[PDB]
Design a protein around this ligand. Structure first.
Ligand SMILES: N[C@@H](CC(=O)O)C(=O)O
Ligand SMILES: [Mg+2]
Ligand SMILES: [Mg+2]
Ligand SMILES: [Mg+2]
Ligand SMILES: [Mg+2]
Ligand SMILES: [Mg+2]
Ligand SMILES: [Mg+2]
Ligand SMILES: [Mg+2]
Ligand SMILES: [Mg+2]
Ligand SMILES: [Mg+2]
Ligand SMILES: [Mg+2]
Ligand SMILES: [Mg+2]
Ligand SMILES: [Mg+2]
Ligand SMILES: [Mg+2]
Ligand SMILES: [Mg+2]
Ligand SMILES: [Mg+2]
Ligand SMILES: [Mg+2]
Ligand SMILES: [Mg+2]
Ligand SMILES: [Mg+2]
Ligand SMILES: [Mg+2]
Ligand SMILES: [Mg+2]
Ligand SMILES: [Mg+2]
Ligand SMILES: [Mg+2]
Ligand SMILES: [Mg+2]
Ligand SMILES: [Mg+2]
Ligand SMILES: [Mg+2]
Ligand SMILES: [Mg+2]
Ligand SMILES: [Mg+2]
Ligand SMILES: [Mg+2]
Ligand SMILES: [Mg+2]
Ligand SMILES: [Mg+2]
Ligand SMILES: [Mg+2]
Ligand SMILES: [Mg+2]
Ligand SMILES: [Mg+2]
Ligand SMILES: [Mg+2]
Ligand SMILES: [Mg+2]
Ligand SMILES: [Mg+2]
Ligand SMILES: [Mg+2]
Ligand SMILES: [Mg+2]
Ligand SMILES: [Mg+2]
Ligand SMILES: [Mg+2]
Ligand SMILES: [Mg+2]
Ligand SMILES: [Mg+2]
Ligand SMILES: [Mg+2]
Ligand SMILES: [Mg+2]
Ligand SMILES: [Mg+2]
Ligand SMILES: [Mg+2]
Ligand SMILES: [Mg+2]
Ligand SMILES: [Mg+2]
Ligand SMILES: [Mg+2]
Ligand SMILES: [Mg+2]
Ligand SMILES: [Mg+2]
Ligand SMILES: [Zn+2]
Lengths: 103, 218, 58, 52, 159
RNA sequence: GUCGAAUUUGGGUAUAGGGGCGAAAGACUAAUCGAACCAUCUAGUAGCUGGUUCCUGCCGAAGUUUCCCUCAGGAUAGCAGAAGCUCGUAUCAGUUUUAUGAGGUAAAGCGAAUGAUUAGAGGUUCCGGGGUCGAAAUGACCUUGACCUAUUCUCAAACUUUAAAUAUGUAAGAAGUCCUUGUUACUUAAUUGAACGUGGACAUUUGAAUGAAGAGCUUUUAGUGGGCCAUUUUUGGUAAGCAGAACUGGCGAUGCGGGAUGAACCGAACGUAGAGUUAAGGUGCCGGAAUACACGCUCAUCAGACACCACAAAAGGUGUUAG
RNA sequence: GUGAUUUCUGCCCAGUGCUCUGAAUGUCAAAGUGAAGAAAUUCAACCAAGCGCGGGUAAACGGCGGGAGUAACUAUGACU
RNA sequence: GAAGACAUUGUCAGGUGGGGAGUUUGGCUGGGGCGGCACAUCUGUUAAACGAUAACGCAGAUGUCCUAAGGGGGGCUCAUGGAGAACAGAAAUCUCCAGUAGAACAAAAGGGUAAAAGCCCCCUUGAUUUUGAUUUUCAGUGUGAAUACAAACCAUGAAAGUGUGGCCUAUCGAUCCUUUAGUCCCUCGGAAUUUGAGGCUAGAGGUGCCAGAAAAGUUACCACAGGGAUAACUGGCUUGUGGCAGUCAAGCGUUCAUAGCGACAUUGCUUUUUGAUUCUUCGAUGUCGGCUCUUCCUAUCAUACCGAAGCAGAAUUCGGUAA
RNA sequence: GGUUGCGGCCAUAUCUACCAGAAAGCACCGUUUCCCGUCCGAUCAACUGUAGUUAAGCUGGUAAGAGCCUGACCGAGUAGUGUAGUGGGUGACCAUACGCGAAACUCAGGUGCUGCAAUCU
RNA sequence: GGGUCGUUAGCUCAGUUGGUAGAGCAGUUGACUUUUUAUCAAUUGGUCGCAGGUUCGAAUCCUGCACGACCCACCA
RNA sequence: UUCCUCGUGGCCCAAUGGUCACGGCGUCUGGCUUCGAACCAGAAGAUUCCAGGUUCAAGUCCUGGCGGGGAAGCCA
């Protein structure tokens, strides 16, 4: 799909409380950190004899992932996020559609 | 190789005609529906006889073909090729299905039985009702004795019981012999190559003037 | 080894053992789902009305 | 049950590979695309390509 | 596999009419609905928004809410061994006054008229309706109407 | 079979159970071996098979919905009992009538939309294939295919103008009707409306029929979750005492009289007795009851004799009867 | 592994193993090293064996193809 | 004598390690397996004119696509046919007339649409925030999808209005953990500050066996609990298939239908073939054939007695009473 | 009664071919500085009502007209269907009792009605 | 025994899924050359085994009636 | 019966939705040689086995038909 790099939308930043200009970028997961309770517990469980203790997913079935937008307000510098349907191809910088021209 | 006709004698299922959903059928064994001097005028063959049904069954296409052939053969050889007009009044539009079944010795190792037993088309048939006409013949009054038994000789090719009737009508028209005769006495009867048109009291008067001139020419 | 898939047999009898009695009716039915803009008015309408009757019969 | 045994050549390296699996295992099927480029003047060991 | 969508088996039920396609006549929007009106439901296939589910076609209920473009309706639905009341929201295009009531309250005001009038002289107004009574006696003359004798008709083929 | 040797054999000794031993059979290891014997964990676990002990009285079902690595099992809803509680002829009903809605089946239709399909007829070619007169012509004549116009025969579960029967929604008042003026932050140009009210007026003919064996409400829990048969509608299949659906009635869970015989058919459902009358079925005898009465048909060198039911067809006969 | 003697044991290392290379921008654990920070810690560089890359190996496991035209009767096809 | 701070030994870490240990190897299914997905869904039909309604029923479809193919406003009307204009002809561009949609609306199909929902143009991001109520599946749970409001901030149009994604019916996901946004809010329990960690609200990372285990095979060396809920013998219904017999008559037969044959059609019988289903038996009915022995059927090879022939005699063919 | 503006029901109102229309209204009709939009003042924009014409639009009438609407003991109590029988038939199917009841076809009649406001020999 | 079909000039064979027989080999004649084989040209030779539907009609369409090829055939 | 595969210049085959489409052998013209080969210069030829839908375009994308080839057929 194609999504513009800017968008004007409601910003609940306690100072805007109205439609404002928002910069948009694609959300990405972010590196998983150690010392989280989950990782610490999982490592504790794996230590010692017994082998693999937690289930490991294999039956992958879905090909795509839902895309999530990261909105940045130009005034209050607060971040809001919203999602879209599934899509195989995604893109911010978009050459707009042109009708009259040929193939 | 043909499954005996007793397996499809009665109307057990809804009509299953060729269409955009059927799309794969054989061809009807019958192709000819009008026999004899089919260009004869309406007034050439006054007498008309019908082969009517006394049953609610399905008549196979090749059964119709065989009766057609036998009747035409007899009429042409005996009464002459230009003494009668034959018209069959049914068409094979119902497709018959079959579940062709493995018939070898030891096929049970492969047959899979009744699972997924939707049939395949192999034949066409026509659905008839009690009182519905199958065959129709129009001739001269002098040829009735030949025709009536020609049909009687033909009835043996269809399954079930079928009567033979002498219609009180003129030719293939929907009018009685005298009432039609007087209507052609006046001018409102004007024939075509095989059938005839009639003047009506309705319509644009100028157009009604254009044809049937004698009816007004009193 | 197949088995009977579905049927509605005997279901009508099963129902009719205990009558299809209508649920009930009441005065002053619930205002759940009605126009809240109308509710907000009505609650003050009664608020004033009771005060009026109280002062009138005082 | 029917078990699949198949032989397949590597697209890029050219080496020959094979395996066998029961007819249910869903191994990943890659996505490819033939893209019809034009070749410009050849510089140093790089190439030089051309879209439409 | 099976298929039970929101509009399944509605091929003919939502076809509009013959020679009645196009826009809706304004009288529907000129209708006025009060709370407590009893009203039937007949879905209009040309207005996809605010349609009723196919089960409620041809049902009748009671208005309980009025909004800018829709009306809240109460419908009694039989499920299992009882009735449950269902609350709907329907645009006025699938809505038309049930004239059963419109006929009914004419009776109410008519009986009011007869009751007061007959109360003015006390002659037992007799308001209740009665079913079709068995017709009372009468006498029939033959003057200029001498009875005609009939007879069964024989069989003729008539083809 | 072999019988001077890879021969046979006594006694002592060594190898011990996931171990030994094997000129290899998964063979032998104390009648036990594709993992010896003894005791303990151990009364191991079992969605699986068998059994489950006295009497009487009252009520009395389900093989169906949804979810589950669920399909020989569970949870959940339903059907049933028990405990009752608030009241005293009602905010009722597997019913009819009046009024008023909705439906796309049965039927019907194709010289009405779509699709299929037999046949001729009349035109139209600046324009199909052609031929004849022709060098050709936007020239003439025939023929075959289209195209158009008026007709003709037959069709549709996934076609249709029209359109039933049976089933199906709502209303037939007191929580009602009419008059006056009070509240509101809602609404209106506006005390205009909307909703809720004060006060006043109208009762047993208070707004169709019939019945009501009391009406309404709450808790808790057993069993069940393999169904089958009959009429009618109907799917796959040539068909089946086949497989799969809809409504109702049964069997299961049910005895009694009849169908000789039978779970489903007909009649009719049950405390213990006496008397009277019948249902379906019968009245030559077995066998209770007229070898009753009356009008006709039939002689069979395989007659016939009662629904479900225990089968018969196409086609023939100066046998016989009536048309 | 094969199973007296005689006569022979043809071609294939692409695949699975085995073995031998290690001059190497391949990859890498613990330990150790460097930088940031106040510290937990984070990020880097380096890194043995192993794997990857490259040879040998069939009396190792094993394998050892199709389609057309063609000769003075026809047929077939030495040949292509 | 040799060897030497190297071996060896001890502890961690990477590699190798069916030699050995533990465990698994979905469900539906006209037995099981192979096949297919009817396993989550959508359109039409089966579906019997409210709703609901099964089968490994029929014809198809989904795990996408779209900053416009969303929203508002304005202007215009499509497919096709006829008639005309240089190259240009059957198809290039332009004009007129007819044109109820026969076109188009992302996709499968069905509804719906003509100053539009279709084509062109202009401006925008309502495809936004806060949780609620309701409809479908339904237990009246969840998920998905959808409807009508309220409180804000906006877009478009002059305005009434419209807009909470795609004209409507499908296009998708629980607990734990990780991660992101908001609040910068609460806690680290002897008292403080800063890192770090843990909490509240709202999303993403996926379970397609789609209410959601992490999972390869063989057994004829096999074992246990069971199942006639389920296959191979036998038995029962049916007769497609096999076998046997009729009815009509185009022809064969030097002429001539029926001396003897008999196509295209059509009516039947049998269960000695092979099929369909799974009703009885899986706490066992001994399952091919050959040998011997008894009885029964007739659809008659011969023998007995007859009729017919394209029966001169001989030989032969058809048929009848006959087991 | 005619006409105009806004409509309600939505063909008895549509379609084809001809004929007629006083007055007013409506209409065609003349022009391009301004606001405005197009390839083009053709549509749309603005000004005049002056220069003209009922030719057209529109309204009404005519047609053994197409269509559309209504009705009829025309077709037909036919097709179909609810309930019952130890009814008939080998069977396909069919009559009877108590009830409901079409479509096609034929014939006859009709060819817009109406609300509010304004104007008109 | 049942299905599946194909047989066309002396020989092989395209035949066109519904109108009239094609091609090659063969043989005869002619040109070439001292005559020939090779090469080229031109003829010759096919009612496509018996009956029906029949489109104007049928080798060609199929149906039954010939000969030669392909596969099928208890059971435990 | 199912499932799969294949059909393209005379022959064998290759094919990017974006050019009537590619190679090798073969064929034709000219050259060398007394001549034919080999050799040297150049060319040409295909309704992608029959009908529809999609696309702007389809050999290709797919659905419906024809011909050919391969696998399956086990516990009784
Ligand atoms: N008794 C098994 C065999 C069934 O059939
Ligand atoms: Mg530790
Ligand atoms: Mg460890
Ligand atoms: Mg069950
Ligand atoms: Mg099922
Ligand atoms: Mg309708
Ligand atoms: Mg010794
Ligand atoms: Mg062994
Ligand atoms: Mg032993
Ligand atoms: Mg115990
Ligand atoms: Mg689960
Ligand atoms: Mg059991
Ligand atoms: Mg329907
Ligand atoms: Mg019908
Ligand atoms: Mg009709
Ligand atoms: Mg049609
Ligand atoms: Mg009703
Ligand atoms: Mg219990
Ligand atoms: Mg329970
Ligand atoms: Mg339960
Ligand atoms: Mg059970
Ligand atoms: Mg039981
Ligand atoms: Mg009983
Ligand atoms: Mg006695
Ligand atoms: Mg008879
Ligand atoms: Mg007689
Ligand atoms: Mg040996
Ligand atoms: Mg390290
Ligand atoms: Mg290394
Ligand atoms: Mg193991
Ligand atoms: Mg299974
Ligand atoms: Mg329904
Ligand atoms: Mg618009
Ligand atoms: Mg829900
Ligand atoms: Mg809004
Ligand atoms: Mg749109
Ligand atoms: Mg929407
Ligand atoms: Mg999630
Ligand atoms: Mg967390
Ligand atoms: Mg599930
Ligand atoms: Mg195992
Ligand atoms: Mg075994
Ligand atoms: Mg059984
Ligand atoms: Mg069997
Ligand atoms: Mg049979
Ligand atoms: Mg047979
Ligand atoms: Mg059995
Ligand atoms: Mg057994
Ligand atoms: Mg036993
Ligand atoms: Mg025995
Ligand atoms: Mg005999
Ligand atoms: Mg050359
Ligand atoms: Zn902001």
């Amino acid at each position: 799909v194609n999504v513009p790099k800017t968008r004007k939308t409601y910003c609940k930043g306690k100072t805007c409380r109205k439609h404002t200009q928002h910069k948009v970028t694609q959300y990405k997961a972010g590196k998983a950190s150690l010392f989280a309770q989950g990782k610490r517990r999982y490592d504790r469980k794996q230590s010692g004899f017994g082998g693999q203790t937690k289930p490991v997913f294999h039956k992958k079935a879905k090909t795509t992932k839902k895309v999530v937008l990261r909105l940045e307000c130009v005034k209050c510098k607060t971040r809001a996020q919203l999602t879209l349907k599934r899509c195989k191809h995604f893109e911010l910088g978009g050459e707009k559609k042109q009708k009259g021209q040929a193939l | 190789a043909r499954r005996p006709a007793r397996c499809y004698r009665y109307q057990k299922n809804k009509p299953y005609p060729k269409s955009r959903y059927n799309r794969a059928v054989p061809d009807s064994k019958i192709r000819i529906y009008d026999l004899g001097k089919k260009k004869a005028t309406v007034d050439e063959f006054p007498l008309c006889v019908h082969l009517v049904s006394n049953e609610l069954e399905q008549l196979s296409s090749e059964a119709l073909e065989a009766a057609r052939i036998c009747a035409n053969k007899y009429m042409t050889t005996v009464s002459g090729r230009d003494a009668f007009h034959l018209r069959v009044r049914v068409h094979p539009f119902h497709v018959l299905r079959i579940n062709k079944m493995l018939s070898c010795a030891g096929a049970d190792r492969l047959q899979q039985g009744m699972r997924g037993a939707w049939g395949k088309p192999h034949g066409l048939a026509a659905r008839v009702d009690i009182g519905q006409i199958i065959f129709s013949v129009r001739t001269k009054d002098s040829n009735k004795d030949v025709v009536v038994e020609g049909l009687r000789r033909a009835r043996y090719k269809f399954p079930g019981q079928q009567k033979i009737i002498l219609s009180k009508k003129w030719g293939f028209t929907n009018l009685d012999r005298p009432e039609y005769l007087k209507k052609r006495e006046a001018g409102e009867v004007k024939d075509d190559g095989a059938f005839v048109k009639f003047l009506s009291k309705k319509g644009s008067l100028e157009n009604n003037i254009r044809e049937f001139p004698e009816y007004f020419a009193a | 080894a197949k088995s009977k898939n579905h049927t509605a047999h005997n279901q009508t009898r099963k129902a009719h053992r205990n009558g299809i009695k209508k649920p009930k009716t009441y005065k002053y039915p619930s205002l759940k789902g009605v126009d809240p803009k109308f509710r907000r008015n009505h609650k003050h309408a009664l608020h004033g009305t009771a005060k009026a009757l109280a002062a009138a019969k005082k | 049950h029917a078990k699949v045994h198949l032989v397949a050549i590597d697209i890029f390296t050219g080496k020959k590979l094979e395996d066998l699996s029961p007819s249910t295992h869903n191994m990943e099927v890659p996505v490819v695309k033939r893209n019809e480029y034009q070749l410009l003047d050849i510089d140093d060991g790089f190439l030089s390509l051309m879209n439409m | 596999g099976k298929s039970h969508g929101y509009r399944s088996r509605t091929r003919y039920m939502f076809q509009r009419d013959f020679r009645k396609h196009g826009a809706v006549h304004l009288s529907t929007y000129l209708k006025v609905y009060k709370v407590g009106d009893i009203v039937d439901i007949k879905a209009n296939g040309s207005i996809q928004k605010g349609m009723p589910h196919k089960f409620y076609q041809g049902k009748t209920g009671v208005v309980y809410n009025v909004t800018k473009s829709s009306v809240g309706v109460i419908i009694n639905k039989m499920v299992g061994n009882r009735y449950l009341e269902k609350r709907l929201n329907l645009r006025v295009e699938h809505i038309k006054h049930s004239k059963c009531r419109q006929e009914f309250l004419e009776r109410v005001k008519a009986n009011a008229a007869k009751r007061a009038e007959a109360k003015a002289q006390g002659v037992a107004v007799q308001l209740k309706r009665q079913p079709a009574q068995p017709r009372e006696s009468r006498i029939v003359s033959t003057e200029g109407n001498v009875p005609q004798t009939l007879a069964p008709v024989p069989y003729e083929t008539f083809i």
